[PDB]
UniProtKB/Swiss-Prot annotation, chain B:
Protein name in the entry: Multidrug resistance protein MexA
Record field: transmembrane: none
Mutant lacking the gene: phenotype: Disruption of MexA, MexB and OprM significantly reduces active efflux of N-(3-oxododecanoyl) homoserine lactone/3-oxo-C12-HSL/PAI-1, but not N-butyryl homoserine lactone/C4-HSL/PAI-2.
Assembly with partners or alone: Component of the MexAB-OprM multidrug efflux complex, composed of six MexA subunits forming a hexameric tube, binding to a MexB trimer, which interact with the trimeric OprM outer membrane channel protein. OprM is thought to not directly contact MexB; instead, MexA joins MexB and OprM by forming a funnel-like hexamer anchored to the inner membrane. MexA may initially form a hexameric ring complex with MexB prior to OprM, then OprM undergoes a conformational change as it contacts MexA, allowing the periplasmic gate to open.
Triggers of expression: By growth under severe iron limitation.
Localisation per UniProt entry: Cell inner membrane
Function: The periplasmic linker component of the MexAB-OprM efflux system that confers multidrug resistance. Functions as the major efflux pump for n-hexane and p-xylene efflux. Has been shown in one study to be involved in the active efflux of the autoinducer N-(3-oxododecanoyl) homoserine lactone, thereby playing an indirect role in quorum-sensing; but has been shown in another study not to be involved in efflux of this autoinducer. Over-expression of the pump increases antibiotic and solvent efflux capacities. Implicated in the secretion of the siderophore pyoverdine.
Note: In both X-ray crystal structures approximately the last 100 residues are not ordered.
Taxonomic placement: Bacteria, Pseudomonadati, Pseudomonadota, Gammaproteobacteria, Pseudomonadales
Family: Belongs to the membrane fusion protein (MFP) (TC 8.A.1) family.
Species in which this protein is naturally found: Pseudomonas aeruginosa (strain ATCC 15692 / DSM 22644 / CIP 104116 / JCM 14847 / LMG 12228 / 1C / PRS 101 / PAO1)
Amino acid sequence: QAVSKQQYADANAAYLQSKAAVEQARINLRYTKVLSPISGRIGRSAVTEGAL
Amino acid sequence: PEVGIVTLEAQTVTLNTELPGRTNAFRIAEVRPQVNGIIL
């Protein structure tokens, strides 16, 4: 009873939001390393370094 | 029946081939901004 159910709610609320954000952050970071979906011969890179 | 034949004889020839093409940069890069602002 040291704290209202409301407070604990709001708390666990933000906690979930965070956990959410982190996972999404993790995924975007992971995608910064572009990999080859398969194995084979790769040709010309249609993109230049520094490109966007 | 007559024809126009040519006497084949051994000649000394050099073997060289010409491959057409275009020149291209060895490597290319683009310069871009990664923050907003004014160019000083």
